[PDB]
Ligand binder design. Structure first.
Ligand SMILES: CC(=O)N[C@H]1[C@H]([C@H](O)[C@H](O)CO)O[C@@](O[C@H]2[C@@H](O)[C@@H](CO)O[C@@H](O[C@H]3[C@H](O)[C@@H](O)[C@H](O)O[C@@H]3CO)[C@@H]2O)(C(=O)O)C[C@@H]1O
Ligand SMILES: CC(=O)N[C@H]1[C@H]([C@H](O)[C@H](O)CO)O[C@@](O[C@H]2[C@@H](O)[C@@H](CO)O[C@@H](O[C@H]3[C@H](O)[C@@H](O)[C@H](O)O[C@@H]3CO)[C@@H]2O)(C(=O)O)C[C@@H]1O
Ligand SMILES: CC(=O)N[C@H]1[C@H]([C@H](O)[C@H](O)CO)O[C@@](O[C@H]2[C@@H](O)[C@@H](CO)O[C@@H](O[C@H]3[C@H](O)[C@@H](O)[C@H](O)O[C@@H]3CO)[C@@H]2O)(C(=O)O)C[C@@H]1O
Lengths: 420, 170, 420, 170, 170, 420
């Protein structure tokens, strides 16, 4: 029931092992092990058949086969209803007492969800047959008084250690484009016309490790970037991007909000493969994807969406609702102060956030024939209650970085209050 | 007696617990003999082919009625029977004596009871093959053994009996 | 070679486990386990086939299939020549010496007998394949001098613990009648005409736990009652006797002697099923089976055949030969003293037994509108040598209970010596 | 980086060693739960039918090129796959705690590298199914577990990586 | 010598005992090598398909004569061969040394002897596959091993030899 | 590369167990066993197939099938490419560290060679699949620096204990003749005409244990005798030689050199079977094989070829090149001193050897109607450097026995130096 700091799309969540149904529906058997005796229960796989459990909120789309395909994309699971993997439990009773050995079949719970704007519109639960659970305790008394006990509710209980591993997968309904040649320091990619019909992903790799600025020529639409999990250090070709069809993706940074004029600043490694999801444009004019390696401390924003702020030449509040990064992650805002430039001319601003708490860093963006450069103007250990004002030079450009420290809501609200 | 329950009137499916051994079937599988510190091991594989359920239906509750109502609330034994499961027991014979251990199957006792005035009017019974249980005893050609060691005259549970119910509908 | 205190019929006797043939005919193998080494011999059931051994005194009737059917009736054995049950032995040799591990196949000996009047007229021995025997001892010397030893006699030796469990089974050639409704306090059953052709069993259950008097209207023929082993606490119906076809029967009380005028007094539990074997009548007149729940201390005779004594109005000995109950069990005798009743009028009697020893209890049978009542007149700690006389009121009825303490002969002789 | 080698120019077949586990396949086989001094055992049989190689070919090195060149210098895994091999792991749960262990396959990483100026220009990769590896952890419904315990984001070797080469001819 | 018996004249079937190993077949099944405290286990399953009897008939005693006369008094090995039986041996290698153990089959030696004047005139021999026996030795590339460890030049019994007879009739 | 003291023929040499190929070509797998955990690798034989390795210098003759047949003759190996024999390794890691468990497949190396005049003209190597090798060591560090290591040379390394067991087999291309009846004290066998076409073996047994002289009537050609390994104490018939077709032979004594006029003196046991290989005669005249049991200390030469020395009536050196017996074995020389007999007449001799070192014993051969008799004349603890002269009676016969103590060369040279 907590917030999920991720972009729209499909996710397979491994919710843990040791799941089993109530009322002993998965009880294999109980052994009464007398003192000075050993007992054992075995799953020998004399038959490789296993019985997965499935549940879905939408049988038409999120069918079992579909869900299984997602699970394969996420964790690369091969076998769903067979196993050659044996499990066995062995227990010796002490000399003084008798022991009770209960063994159950178990499952690993994988949750497939269709996540849209902080909401789950579709959900399926796949229970992958696991390697069992064994409970040993002092044998109960054959004479223990029988207590009429009503059956429990139909369902599952979790028996294994806590686990919640989220793995996003490429949306199978959105096509994958591919930039064959490792992109150099500068590169422009023309988005195919297919973009008018649906969003797509662009798979690529950089020729040189470093920080990169990525965006559409108009900073619109907003871009999202992912890493191809496990794509590093596999087949490689200096003059060509080797494929793995890895459909498992790690969200780096990016947003879905339609009016989030912006560009990305991310750290990219050449030994890895990345995906840039371009939303459905829906225009007859050709859009472009521009890549540019940045030298300099612009890397301070590494892995962050830089949101360009609009309508600043007014007084008071200036709210900007955006999908919140996870605790510890960044989200940036670019500000070109209204008015012409001349050192002395300035305007008073008060930076603040409203839903989630975080740590802020104010930078002065400067140009050089050696690339960009950021000068730290100030830092904020409390953004939700910041009241400290700051004067900024008119006609100058500032970037405000927010590191989330508290994820209270799906969206993080940024307020660039203008005092004057 | 065993017919006095504290339940509203109606028909119920009850899980009497695992660990039930059946009347006089004690030595049907045979016994094992070892001595002088040797370790003895006996085991089995309740393969569907062998392990078959024991039904004791009544007028109001036929076999089918019992099966479906048990497999609906509790473990579906018909499906599980397709997957072989094993169990073994081991024990070390004493230094200078003989050890005898015999094996028998254990079951889960399920019941379908008809209640009326907090008393069971009808009772159907089902024993679903579970695993197994071994009994040991040390000996020498001399010793006389209590015959109850070898024989169970009345079905019973080697663990604590249970009473987990659910009222049947329709 | 000892006495078998049971009525005529079929019996399956489990004579124990660990039986094997002589001359190592069942030797599986020997392992020489060197010091600081472990050895193991396994019966993996890679093949489920087992080889039972059979022997019969009458192949025509007591054939192997027939015997197997009896074994199923007695112990409910399912598999006779197959097994999925594994057995294995593991032994580690010490650091100082070598160990010899011998393993043999074994059998459980089941004896099927046709018991008639203290005699076995037919016999079959079924050897059910068992779970082996392992013998470990210090390894013999490879140099030990060889001793010419003549082979032993062909046969079986017992290797397991002592055991002799007797289980009677319904005679498959005698039909089973069934009283569907749980009998109330009083009940009369008309014996079908089929009784003229052969003995039969009547299966029934009482609606109320308690003591019951059961007999034929003329106290002839004598009745025998059995309990259906394991019939308790299974399927039940308050208005109907649920069946289990349980052919395994536990002899409670009853005799076969044709002239044993009598009736039974037994304790019956409603949660159990019972069988009353009615001998072949052989008359065109319809016989009846009367049941009556008794309230009162008549229960003192609980589980006993009450033999009505005849020809008492004479002097001296009055012998009554009857099949002897087992040690600890009862056998009773009813006596209506010759002559008319009037407190003072009496006759001297000396109770004694001749074959088996026992403890006697003399009761005075009295009537009440609340049922019967017994008054203890005397007790005897020695019946075989009792010389103590007792005077009994003429025209009065006395019951003498004998608890067997010594089973020397198939029959127990009761002597109601009349002194006057 | 990982592309700087000290080898004459040419194509080589390299044995990167045994003990490689693959990205995010950690729990594909399932996990096992035990407690209070019980011994838990998990194992498997890399039967050809299941254990299949993972090929990552390049332009200069296709699947066939990789296979033949690996099976020519190193263990012929195609032949070996015909013979079933087993492996098991066992561990005893602590006295009053729970134990969780999960199993995953291990592989032998083989590489076909194109060298030019002491730097790898092209690299094909092959993972030959080897045996297996188990990871354990003690727990109770409370504890929070480091997720790296359950997930491997990048292929890696649980043993020491290796670099045993041989220049390819023809 | 071995032909001097104290029996009336006639033909006899003799059980020379279990535990016989055959000439030079010592290492036919192979050997096992372990080190540093590792536990090594070797075993087998004398499946009829493999374990075949060794007959050494004479003029007066052909194969059939030998078989029928052995299976008549002693264990019927032809029937038993239909049921698979297993045996295993395990041993732990020393802390910092190597262990080598090899396995070989054991047999029951049966004999059909023709007696005349307390001396064997004719002798037929049969070896019925029994179980197995392992021999161990610790080592290091240096050590020289007594070759008798690896080779048995004459059939012999690892247990005490026996002489259990029965005069044959007809 | 050492000398092989054996006659021409075929030999199967078991060169040891634990052989495996380089570069881990036989590596089955490695297990990383965490502390307080046990690991196991198993060869369950779920499939009985094994893969033997073969190599030959002559595919035409020494083919794999041929070699396998020789291996069967030598060690009686039944299965070459299948096994039902399981092997398994189990290891527990300590509480303090992690253990590495490596398991390899192994082979037993059997070498088949065609040995001719101290030379191997043909050779085949058969690698019989064995029961594996397990290496346990402290788990290496996952961080241990990677060292570029060039692959080793293609080949085999020996991992098991040192072993070199030589077993000769009957040459399958030379026929076997058989003397059916156990030979008595005296026996003459006529060599069939087949001998003109190729060498043959004569299988036989002696009726009485003792020492025997065996030779051709002209002491030419030289004979070689073998023992049939494992032939002792099997099927026997006092009036007939029972066969075992045992093709495994143990070289007792004998030579191949064409001009080695001689006869054999060997100890023969009746419970064993022997083979005498007669070279290809190549003459139209019938040859004979004479056997004669010797009573007396002629047994001192037991198992030795007695070489009759020729051309002695000259001065100086008298060299005799012969195939050398193995260290510890004998080779004898018979000398009838030139000249007529008369006690006083003598000649000076100096016995010496040149290639191999040994211990010499000089005997005076004497006749008796009780057989022969040897009188020790002198002994020599050093033959290679013996300078001590000895005077021998002319017309008398002496036998010089040499026990090899140093096998430096295939041939042992005997020098009967005549001083006068
Ligand atoms: C300084 C300022 O103008 N802040 C706005 C921001 C920014 O303009 C925006 O983030 C671009 O940087 O927008 C806020 O949200 C409104 C904005 O997204 C507009 C864009 O169309 O939509 C409004 O909601 C619409 C909605 O899109 C329609 O579907 C619906 O039918 O009508 C709604 C009318 O309210 C957003 O409220 C923001 O929170 O970022 C508002 C700030 O004041
Ligand atoms: C007091 C008294 O009369 N005692 C008898 C008893 C009782 O009469 C009897 O137990 C009834 O209560 O009988 C004794 O045995 C004889 C009795 O059973 C009669 C009945 O027919 O048979 C005698 O044997 C017969 C046998 O039945 C025939 O098959 C056979 O051809 O002839 C026999 C003639 O002897 C019994 O001996 C008893 O011991 O209980 C004898 C008492 O004296
Ligand atoms: C005392 C004496 O004469 N010693 C000889 C011995 C003996 O004559 C021989 O051992 C018989 O007892 O022979 C030595 O070797 C020569 C001998 O074998 C002759 C026999 O033909 O052959 C010589 O070699 C031949 C060879 O056989 C031919 O194939 C080849 O074409 O020509 C060779 C000519 O040298 C042997 O050298 C011996 O060492 O025993 C020589 C002694 O002097």
């Amino acid at each position: 029931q907590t917030i999920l700091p991720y972009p729209n799309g499909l996710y397979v969540i491994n919710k843990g092992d040791g799941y089993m149904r109530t009322n002993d529906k998965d009880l294999i058997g109980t052994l009464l092990i007398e003192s000075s005796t050993s007992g054992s229960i075995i799953q020998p796989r004399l038959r490789n058949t296993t019985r997965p459990l499935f549940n879905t909120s939408n049988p038409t789309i999120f069918s079992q086969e579909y869900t299984e395909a997602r699970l394969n994309d996420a964790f690369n699971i091969q076998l769903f209803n067979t196993s050659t993997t044996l499990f066995k439990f062995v227990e010796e009773a002490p000399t003084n007492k008798n022991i009770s050995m209960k063994v159950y079949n178990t499952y690993e719970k994988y949750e497939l969800i269709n996540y849209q704007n902080g909401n789950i519109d579709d959900k399926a639960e796949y229970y992958l047959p696991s390697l069992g659970k064994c409970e040993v305790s002092d044998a109960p008394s054959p004479q223990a008084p029988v207590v009429e006990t009503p059956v429990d509710q139909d369902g599952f209980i979790q028996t294994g250690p806590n686990e919640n591993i989220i793995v996003g997968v490429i949306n199978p309904s959105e096509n994958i484009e591919e930039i064959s040649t490792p992109i150099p320091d500068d590169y422009t990619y023309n988005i195919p016309t297919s973009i008018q019909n649906n969003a797509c992903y662009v798979l690529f790799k950089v020729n040189t490790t470093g920080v990169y600025k990525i965006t559409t020529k108009n900073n619109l639409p907003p871009l999202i970037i992912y890493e191809a999990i496990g794509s590093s250090n596999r087949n490689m070709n200096s003059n060509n991007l080797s494929n793995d069809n890895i459909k498992a993706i790690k969200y780096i940074t990016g947003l879905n909000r339609s009016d989030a004029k912006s560009y990305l600043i991310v750290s990219l490694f050449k030994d890895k493969n990345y995906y840039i999801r371009i939303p459905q444009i829906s225009s007859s004019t050709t859009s472009q994807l521009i890549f540019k390696r940045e030298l300099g401390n612009i890397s301070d924003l590494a892995d962050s969406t830089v949101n360009i702020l609009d309508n600043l030449n007014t007084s008071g509040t200036h709210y900007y609702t955006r999908q919140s990064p996870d605790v510890g992650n960044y989200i940036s805002y670019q500000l070109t102060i209204p008015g012409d430039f001349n050192n002395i001319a300035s305007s008073i601003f008060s930076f603040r956030t409203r839903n989630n708490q975080g740590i802020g860093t104010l930078y002065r963006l400067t140009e050089s024939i050696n690339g960009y450069n950021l000068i730290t103007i100030n830092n904020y250990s409390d953004l939700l209650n910041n009241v400290e004002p700051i004067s900024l030079l008119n006609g100058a450009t500032y970037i405000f970085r927010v590191k989330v420290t508290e994820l209270n809501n799906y969206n993080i609200i940024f307020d660039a209050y203008r005092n004057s | 007696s065993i017919n006095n329950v504290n339940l509203a009137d109606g028909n119920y499916v009850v899980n009497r617990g695992d660990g039930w051994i059946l009347s006089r079937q004690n030595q049907n599988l045979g016994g094992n003999i070892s001595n002088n510190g040797c370790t003895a091991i006996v085991g089995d594989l309740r393969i569907r082919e062998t392990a078959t359920p024991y039904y004791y239906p009544t007028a109001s509750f036929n076999e089918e009625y019992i099966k479906n109502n048990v497999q609906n609330v509790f473990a579906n034994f018909t499906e599980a029977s397709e997957i072989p499961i094993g169990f073994e027991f081991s024990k070390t014979a004493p230094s200078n004596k003989s050890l005898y251990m015999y094996l028998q199957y254990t079951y889960i006792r399920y019941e379908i009871i008809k209640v009326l005035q907090n008393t069971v009017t009808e009772r159907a019974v089902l024993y679903v093959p579970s695993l197994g249980y071994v009994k040991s005893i040390e000996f020498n050609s001399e010793e006389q053994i209590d015959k109850n060691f070898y024989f169970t005259s009345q079905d019973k549970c080697i663990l604590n009996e249970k009473f987990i119910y659910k009222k049947i509908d329709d």
